[PDB]
From a paper:
Bone morphogenetic proteins (BMPs) and other members of the transforming growth factor-β (TGF-β) superfamily, like the activins, growth and differentiation factors (GDFs) and TGF-βs are secreted signaling proteins that regulate the development, maintenance and regeneration of tissues and organs. Members of the TGF-β superfamily bind two different types of serine/threonine-kinase receptors termed type I and type II receptors. In the present study we analyze the interaction of BMP-2 with its type I receptor BMPR-IA and its type II receptor ActR-IIB.
Crystals from this complex comprising the BMP-2 variant L100K/N102D were obtained under different crystallization conditions and exhibit distinct morphology. Analysis of this complex yielded a hexameric ligand-receptor arrangement with all receptor binding epitopes occupied as expected for the dimeric BMP-2. Inspection of the receptor-ligand interactions of both BMP-2/receptor complexes (comprising BMP-2 L100K/N102D, in the following termed ternary complex (1:2:2), or wildtype BMP-2, in the following termed ternary complex (1:1:1)) demonstrates that the ligand-receptor interfaces are highly similar. Confirming this, our structure of the ternary complex (1:2:2) comprising BMP-2L100K/N102D shows no additional intermolecular H-bond between the lysine side chain and Cys59 of ActR-IIB. In the structures of the Act-A:ActR-IIBECD and the ternary complex (1:2:2) of BMP-2L100K/N102D the Lys and Asp residues form a stable intramolecular salt bridge. Accordingly, Lys100 and Asp102 (in BMP-2L100K/N102D) exhibit low temperature factors indicating that both residues are quite immobile.
Author numbering:
A (entry chain C), F (entry chain C): 6 to 99
B (entry chain B), E (entry chain B): 32 to 123
C (entry chain A), D (entry chain A): 10 to 114
Write the structure that this text describes.
């Protein structure tokens, strides 16, 4: 089968009672791709990391080695990719 | 994840409803809606947790005029009475 | 509404269908069936899935997409005594024979 | 037959339904839906129950009794990132969102 | 209770059918049937174990003329060709 | 909940690889009645016991303390009842 590892992060690790950072081993069904994702906010210049982790088979993440937020100017940024720790770094380009 | 919430039901009551009351793990709801022939009705009941966010949000594009509202405290829908979305007139 | 998703009566009589030659007991049984519209919103007792709920919403917007369907969501078993091909007697508790609850899927 | 029970296409676009204000990702997804007749006999891949099989036989004899219905019998999940009422970001793997297989029930 | 039987399929083939062959835990079948407009067709495929006794037995009272036959050995339905039930004429 | 015990018998205990006689504790779902049954053949005078055991909620067995085969002249006789060991004895009356 196919395995996967991603960078894990949770800005709200308090209430959710989880770690603030770490790694995550993804688990997917038969012949289903596995991805990683990242999401953040851009408080005018300064970037607030919101969450990072595993993401299930999604057409929008296929064959993407890098995590890139494509939405022009969203309230919450997001990017996903197909590769171990591919969410370790991310960028924003409309 | 267990049946803990109690709601009032009307028109959407399950069979085992006791005194127009249903139990659920999700949300209570009340809905006002206008049918294909211009008649308006108010109904209410219980909504299971799975899919409640989709149903409580509803869609502005629904073909029938309606407003559904949800709440998550015991019998919170007994006095919940939503109003229909306004009808847009024009260009005339 | 009388037209909404719910259980309806249905007695299956083995003599009528012609299975009395191989089924010894029972002579028949109440199977029931589910039928009725699944309109918005789907109440708790209709035991729907996220998918059926979403399809119900889409249908509400675009009638070209069909409504969810009313089907059994809980079934029960009945015991039957029958003769196999070798004219040998067999007792079996057939599962999923009786509709106990209907829902939208 | 083109009219028999099978999976059909259905893409749910969040922008169109209006849920893009609370759903951050994905922009939408292929949900599919099941539709089609369930005539006799019910093949293996239609994953039917004893009850649906019996109802199909009864309908074959008495058309007043409806046919079994084509519904999802296997569903899969998708990840969604959304904002709760508190404008807080939540990641959840919603179960039973995508139709993988259709059957008669 | 596991998928061990192989059958030939035609008109009832699953999607993952390999060379008009389906796999099942139940029985293979072949059926000849006359539709509402007098046309006769021969079809075949796999039938799951649950409910196979009901389906293989069929009902004499079926509204359409048909004959289905089952068998439980690999590809046993490749040459299985049932004949329709005779039409009863009269009282004339 | 409600419990139940019946007389167990299997004429074909060989191939089925089970006991030929004994007892059986019935298991039923919520608020569902539990019964016992017996089935036999009548080889013109001589009676061949075929099977006895538990039987699930069945309208035809309701409130019957005795096991009675009502079918006029069937190929295989049968009777069921609602009571512990109620199938210990049976009779035939059209």
């Amino acid at each position: 089968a196919e395995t996967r590892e991603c960078i894990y992060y949770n800005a709200n690790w308090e209430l959710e009672r989880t770690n603030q950072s770490g790694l995550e081993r993804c688990e997917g069904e038969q012949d289903k791709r596995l991805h990683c994702y990242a999401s953040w906010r851009n408080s005018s210049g300064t970037i607030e990391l919101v969450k990072k982790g595993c993401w299930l088979d999604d057409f929008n993440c296929y064959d993407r080695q890098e995590c890139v937020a494509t939405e022009e100017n969203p309230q919450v940024y997001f990017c996903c990719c197909e590769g171990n720790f591919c969410n370790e770094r991310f960028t924003h380009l409309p | 994840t267990l049946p803990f919430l109690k709601c009032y039901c009307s028109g959407h009551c399950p069979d085992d409803a006791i005194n127009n009351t249903c139990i659920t793990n999700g949300h209570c709801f009340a809905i006002i809606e206008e049918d294909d022939q211009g008649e308006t009705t108010l109904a209410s009941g219980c909504m299971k947790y799975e899919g409640s966010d989709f149903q409580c949000k509803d869609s502005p594009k629904a073909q029938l005029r309606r407003t559904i509202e949800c709440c998550r405290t015991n019998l919170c829908n007994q006095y919940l009475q939503p109003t229909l979305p306004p009808v847009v007139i024009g260009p005339f | 509404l009388k037209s909404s998703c719910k259980r309806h009566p249905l007695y299956v009589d083995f003599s009528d269908v012609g299975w009395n030659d191989w089924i010894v007991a029972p002579p028949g049984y109440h199977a029931f069936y589910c039928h009725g519209e699944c309109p918005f919103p789907l109440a708790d007792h209709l035991n729907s899935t996220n998918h059926a709920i979403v399809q119900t919403l889409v249908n509400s917007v675009n009638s070209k997409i069909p409504k969810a369907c009313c089907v059994p969501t809980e079934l029960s078993a009945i015991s039957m005594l029958y003769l196999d091909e070798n004219e040998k007697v067999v007792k079996k508790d057939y599962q999923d024979m009786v509709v106990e609850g209907c829902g939208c899927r």
